[PDB]
Amino acid sequence: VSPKTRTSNLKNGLTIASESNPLVQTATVGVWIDAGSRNENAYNNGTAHFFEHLAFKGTDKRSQHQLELDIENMGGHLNAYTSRESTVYYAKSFKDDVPKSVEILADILQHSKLAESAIDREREVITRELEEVNKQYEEVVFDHLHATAFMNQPLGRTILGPRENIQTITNTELRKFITENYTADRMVLVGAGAVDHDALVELAEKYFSHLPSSQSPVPLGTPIPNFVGSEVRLRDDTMPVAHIAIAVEGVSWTSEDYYTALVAQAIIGNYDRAVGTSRHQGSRLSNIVSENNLANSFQSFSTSYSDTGLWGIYLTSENTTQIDDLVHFTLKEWNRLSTSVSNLQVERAKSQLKAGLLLSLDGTTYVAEDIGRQLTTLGRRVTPAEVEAKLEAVTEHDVRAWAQKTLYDKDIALVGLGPIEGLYDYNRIRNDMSMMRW
Amino acid sequence: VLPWSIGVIIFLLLIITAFMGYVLVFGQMSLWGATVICNLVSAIPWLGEDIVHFLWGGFSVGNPTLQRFFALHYLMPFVLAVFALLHLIALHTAGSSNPLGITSNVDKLSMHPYYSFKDLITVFAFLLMFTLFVFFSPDKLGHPDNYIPANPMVTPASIVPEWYLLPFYAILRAIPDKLGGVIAMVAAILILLILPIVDRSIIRGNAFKPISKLLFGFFICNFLLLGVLGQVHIEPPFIVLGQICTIFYFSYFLILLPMVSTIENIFFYIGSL
Amino acid sequence: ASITSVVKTSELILKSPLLSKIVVPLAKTYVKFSGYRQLGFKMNDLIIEETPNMQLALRRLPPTESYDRVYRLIRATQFSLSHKLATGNDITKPEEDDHYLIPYILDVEAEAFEKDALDNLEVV
Amino acid sequence: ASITSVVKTSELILKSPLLSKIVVPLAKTYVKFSGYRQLGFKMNDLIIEETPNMQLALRRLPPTESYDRVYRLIRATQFSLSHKLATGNDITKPEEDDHYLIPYILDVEAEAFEKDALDNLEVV
Amino acid sequence: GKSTYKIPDFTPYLKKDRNTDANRLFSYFMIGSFGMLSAAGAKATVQDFLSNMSASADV
Amino acid sequence: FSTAEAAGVKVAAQDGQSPISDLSVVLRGGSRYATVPGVSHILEKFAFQNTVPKSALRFVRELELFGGKLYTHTTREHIVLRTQFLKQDLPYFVDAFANVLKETKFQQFELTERVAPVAELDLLKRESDPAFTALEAAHEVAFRTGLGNSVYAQGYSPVTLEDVKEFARQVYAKQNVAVVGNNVVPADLQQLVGTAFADLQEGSKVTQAGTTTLHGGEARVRTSTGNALTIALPIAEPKPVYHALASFLGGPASMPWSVGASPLAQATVGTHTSVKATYHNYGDAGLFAITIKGDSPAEISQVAHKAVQALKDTGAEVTEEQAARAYAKSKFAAAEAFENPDSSASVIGMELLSGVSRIAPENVQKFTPAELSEAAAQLSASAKPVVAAVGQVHALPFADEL
Amino acid sequence: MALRKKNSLLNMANSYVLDSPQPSNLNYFWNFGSLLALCLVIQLATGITLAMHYT
Ligand code: HEC
Ligand code: HEC
Ligand SMILES: CCCCCCCCCCCCO[C@@H]1O[C@H](CO)[C@@H](O[C@H]2O[C@H](CO)[C@@H](O)[C@H](O)[C@H]2O)[C@H](O)[C@H]1O
Ligand SMILES: CCCCCCCCCCCCO[C@@H]1O[C@H](CO)[C@@H](O[C@H]2O[C@H](CO)[C@@H](O)[C@H](O)[C@H]2O)[C@H](O)[C@H]1O
């Protein structure tokens, strides 16, 4: 039984949340922000990611070099990432180096220089990043998947932004972005590991007290997405492995079906030929794929946002003449969530998840990421007892009902990359979303 | 299993083809055979009578029946040839079985010239048998009544099918009920479809199975007895004998083959330890 | 039928004293009349192999056993087509009639049947 | 007919002043009426490729030329099925209608025809 | 022209209510109507055609 | 971690406040003990195959009912088999480890169809990183055998089922087995290990055939899939100061989109290359390595010169600031290693199987600038420098150039 | 593998009427092939029926 997550507010509306662990000697403090690429329009798309680079380029006090040294001398490291809906900046350190790290984080967020010289320098670095993501196939696949599923909508934009924007981002629009978005009511200061809650609250009162509040404070995790069934094909005959994603519109963080969607996802599950145990897994699709060598791997996913989600599967295969079989078998396994699933599969998946949701949290950074994610998406940390009750409430009837409204005979977004000649056209793929025999 | 199952349908098509061809002569056997075989359809409940009138195209076997059987008898051999080709295409995935029942993948021969020249021997043996019947005894296998023109009034002494259908006719006579008899007669052909299930042996074929070989001998001779009983008069003691042979026919598929094949499995294992 | 079935039933018989007393001598005569040894086969050479399970068990034979099986099948095929029987050393002696394949197929089937059972497990 | 034939005969015409004076303007209008440029093709995209010789010449294209050919064919196929024509930059301008393939096929055929000749050589 | 994340313009064709049940239902009504007439036409064709085999007017 | 003994097996457990328990069996069976090359990798991959009580398939299907996870790895020193599960399911996992050590049926088909193919995919995935290859090659040059044996099974030298069965007869024995339980009640674990591992052979301590000998030289692994260079210096007397020196010289950045303030990090400026100093203590010898990967062989060469200069410069003088920065970076590195379950298990495993008491992160020694400069001076003046080049080896530096 | 591809008979049908890879730009003059197949089927059905009544 894990220690209780303590939560406090400041006056401005900044949330402080902590989970102490007297068994460890390191601590992860950081700032989770309910803001990301989705907050840009089409003209300043790429700003949030641009800022992440400049946050570490020097502040009004410490220069770039001083910043580097200060962190080196702390002993730990700083890390940051910007997603579509969330920005994080954290610092892993030693137990007694926590006040230094909070001070550095507060500095880079509130008091960054954003000097024209450094804007101009990063503008090349980020330009080069556009031609090197090209290698990270999973990311290429999922970025096209968002682009097409949420065609011409904010969620459909990339995080990097277009080349044209990177050339025209000014310090003014950077400043404007972080002034509008990085507000106290959108931010959570999180500490996990060897942190005292009351010590962290004092550090927050010392460094984050002069944060602007937004004019209209909505609750944390507050958002209209209109999914487009569609396909992107990026055929490349020179690649040896095909990467394919298929997704339907999934569920948001606060959907009533959030846990039902997780159980459904767990019924299909994951597979990887390189892992020893995978040939033995209970999942039907796993068995079909492994026996027939249809794929190197597949990974079911259920990605959530504030007002929508994507639920689907990501497949990789070298079997380029049997891609049709791989996709056929995968969609027919989805059909069975609507037609055939019983207490047998549902109870097996529930058992696997009851542990899985707890197992994931195995280090201070994972704990901090869990506190931060939950606080910025749900507005509270959900206790393991509540999660256990929500999972227990998922029945076979619930899964069937969900699949019949979400999956059965629905439009898909489909992205294929590599030697995908044998992936059939949209109609034949989409026709596998139903069974004529049912 | 697939070439075998298609094979059973080829056999049904051959029966229908040959039945209709026999009617085209329109002798006494032609007419009276068509009458009694087509009347078996009257057993189908509710719609049986309507179906018979629809087949006949009238109220009895007559000109409409004859003309439609001509058209169908012309067509059926083409259908038969297609199914014959399908069963071969299905077989081509496994290749031919062989008299040892083991794999032949280890030692293959080209179909030509070896089987081409071996097929010539039986072609010439066949042609010799053909010649002896066609040129020297052309009427031995036939019924003299078919040289009498069809007469709906006079009923021939004995209405029997051609010899090759006789075992199924004996099976039909064995069941007293009309519908019962028809079901049994059809089952006698369709029961071939369950051999793949009821044969429980771990070994393919009988070359090495002494008990199965004896049972096969009895089964074959019983099928010949059924044939003979199909052309006797319905009189004692052939009535009871017909029933016993019919029981034996069905019990081969349903009881004996499953028993014997299970036991031989055990004897092979224990006997070689 | 499965080799598993055959082997289990045989073991029930070999356990019962009465049963073994009456079955074992019959099985020995059955095998003598079967006459597969007169073609230089071992019993296990006759088991139907055109099955996924049996293909897997055959792949798992040690190379030596595998090469010798191929020779027995070819030699037997040659006796069959010539209408001759084995003579001398080609006749399989009862001591050479070893169940070389049975352990392999029993393991393949063990897993196949466990898989079927576990595909129907119900959390209690 | 062979590309070699076509190329040689064309060169005979281009040499003769009179012939070129009357043929070249006709050929230019022929190509205008042909209208393959309206589907964004280059002339050489239309040459029949289901021959061993042409398969060989296509394999010998530089990768860039090869990738661009594939795109032109796909784009033209999409215009065809939509019953639209190319517009703007998709229309092949006369300066872009380059004989990218002709040198490759002429070399492949050169060897094929030399081979045929030399297969019939007679020591004198 | 260059970025493959900028989906080409499909606004001339995209339906605003594309994810609604009403939208699917309409297209299945068309498919269903076509199946319905094909079934009714098949029935009429088969019935009229096979009736040739029933007793003719001279019988 | 309260060290105790249960039925001849050393058991170390630390109770915690989490629903997640990690039980790890640490075996004295790493590559330095390998009878035949690659056997320790194979034995690791043969864990949780068919046992006599329970099939591999049945184990995996039941582990999915508990939602447990299985992690295995081989080092030069140990094989580690870790399971992660919910606290309450401890008895199941103890019994499963007992079945693996007592009753593994090492069947030839498992080796051909299951174990060997997976071991080969494991290796190919690691070698995708040229820096991994370079540091493996450097150990091979430096030690030849023992520590110089490959950790992973390779295709050129095949392991047989007799090899694996023999090695397992040595390794799977009370003398070579330690159990480490993170977030496991220590009294409960002792009771369960005491009943489950009672019937395990006693066996004897597995030993390295032959003494560790140090050698200098060059290795030139020609690949087409990336470029890297390791500059290693074999250490005859492993000392804790080399940790501080590794962290000082550094190489990785402590901040996104930055180069870093470490000497080796500063050696990469203007190049798309990365660098990393590491020190490996193996008890009786050590290896101090500096690995540089990059896309350009020219840039790698350029950095490699600066890197050896940096080490020489350190041998000259370290500032007080720099020495404190080294203490901080080193304490932190020790802490996160004791947190990560993979490394944690092996740390206490070493304490239990050898007798090297673990150095708590709170007891990491502070080295003065004098002690650090002295350590760097010994390295710059080593008689046996090792260089492993990977990739376009014709364009990478040689030992005599450095 | 999908049954339509695995089974040899189904696979022959499959290769002609279902998976058969066609150019994506055939116009309506490619439809006469199937019309000819339709006429041939109509001629068979009507022809066999006329044969049942013709002398
Ligand atoms: C017996 C099977 C049969 C088949 C198959 C058949 N027909 Fe006929 N066909 C007939 C009969 C019987 C007649 C004569 C009765 C009649 O004229 O309608 C006939 C008559 C015709 C006539 C003359 C029609 C008239 O009355 O003016 C034509 C033309 C003809 N067939 C063409 C074809 C063609 C073309 C095909 C196929 C390609 C074909 N037939 C297939 C039986 C057949
Ligand atoms: C009831 C079953 C059945 C019927 C009826 C049948 N076949 Fe066969 N046929 C088979 C089977 C089963 C095989 C595969 C036998 C094998 O090689 O082991 C076969 C194989 C063959 C072969 C391969 C050579 C051979 O004799 O083994 C030919 C040729 C053949 N059949 C022709 C025909 C023809 C022609 C007809 C009728 C017109 C026909 N068959 C009717 C079941 C049948
Ligand atoms: C597996 C398929 C099922 C078996 C198929 C059944 C085959 C034929 C049965 C019905 C055939 C005769 O059935 C009969 O059909 C004809 C039309 O064809 C109908 O007749 C009706 O329409 C025709 C014209 O369309 C008119 O000339 C007539 O006056 C009118 O009554 C009869 O109302 C119906 O009783
Ligand atoms: C038109 C009515 C529908 C019935 C089909 C028509 C009957 C004619 C079929 C027999 C002729 C042989 O048909 C031949 O079969 C094989 C497999 O089936 C096809 O083979 C093709 O498909 C299979 C998979 O679909 C691939 O293994 C193969 O690489 C490819 O060439 C041939 O391209 C076709 O020429």
Numbering used by the authors:
A (entry chain A): 26 to 248, 260 to 474
B (entry chain N): 111 to 383
C (entry chain R), D (entry chain G): 2 to 125
E (entry chain E): 39 to 97
F (entry chain B): 15 to 416
G (entry chain C): 1 to 55
Paper text:
The cytochrome bc 1 complex, also known as respiratory complex III (CIII), in the electron-transfer chain of the inner mitochondrial membrane is a homodimer (CIII2) of two biochemically identical protomers. CIII2 catalyses the transfer of electrons from the lipophilic two-electron donor ubiquinol (QH2) to the water-soluble, one-electron acceptor protein cytochrome c, contributing to an electrochemical proton gradient across the membrane.
(viii) +DQ: with decylubiquinone (high-potential chain oxidized). The [2Fe–2S] cluster can thus be positioned close to the Qo site (referred to here as the b or proximal position), which is formed by cyt b. However, widening of the docking crater on cyt b, as seen in Pf-type inhibitor-bound structures, was not observed in the b positions of apo CIII2 or of CIII2 when a substrate analogue was added.
